[PDB]
Amino acid sequence: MRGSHHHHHHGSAVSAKIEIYTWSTCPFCMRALALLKRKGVEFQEYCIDGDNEAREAMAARANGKRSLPQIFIDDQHIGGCDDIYALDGSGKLDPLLHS
């Protein structure tokens, strides 16, 4: 196990769980995607183009909301494009990501 290792009782290593439900061609979804990509974070996109079932699954987790996109971090609901950009503008997004 050669290398410069970091020790702080992590045990098994996980990182921020970031999810975004999208339509690929939605300009608001695209805008939210761009922000996340710029940050360089690892995340999961659920592109649900024309997928009615997945939308109902999304709405179940997002306060019944069916608007796109819907964003989650560590299983907490962040909201849509405006929401994440508002958090970033007030310096609240990076420590959720989480740095």
Residue numbers in the entry: -10 to 88
Text of the article:
In the case of the glutaredoxin that is the focus of this study, glutaredoxin A from the cyanobacterium Synechocystis sp. PCC 6803 serves as the preferred electron donor for the 2-electron reduction of arsenate to arsenite, catalyzed by arsenate reductase. As part of the thioredoxin superfamily, glutaredoxin A shares the characteristic thioredoxin fold. The structure of the wild-type protein is comprised of the major protein secondary structure elements: four α-helical segments, and four mixed parallel: anti-parallel β-strands that form a single β-pleated sheet. Our random mutagenesis approach has yielded four new crystal structures of glutaredoxin A, one for each of the following variants: R27L, A75I, A79S, and P84R.
Due to the location of Ala75, one might have predicted that changes in structure and function observed for the A75I and the A79S variants would be subtle. These replacements are located at the extreme C-terminus of the protein in α-helix 4, and both are exposed to the outside surface of the helix. Neither is involved in crystal packing interactions nor core packing interactions, and therefore, these positions are predicted to be highly tolerant of modification. However, in the case of the A79S mutant, there are minor structural changes observed in the geometry of α-helix 4. There is a measurable decrease in the twist of the helix, a decrease in the helix-bending angle of α-helix 4. The significance of these minor changes remains to be explored. The R27L crystal structure lacks two neighbors; the A75I and A79S mutant have no net differences, while the P84R mutant adds three possible interactions.
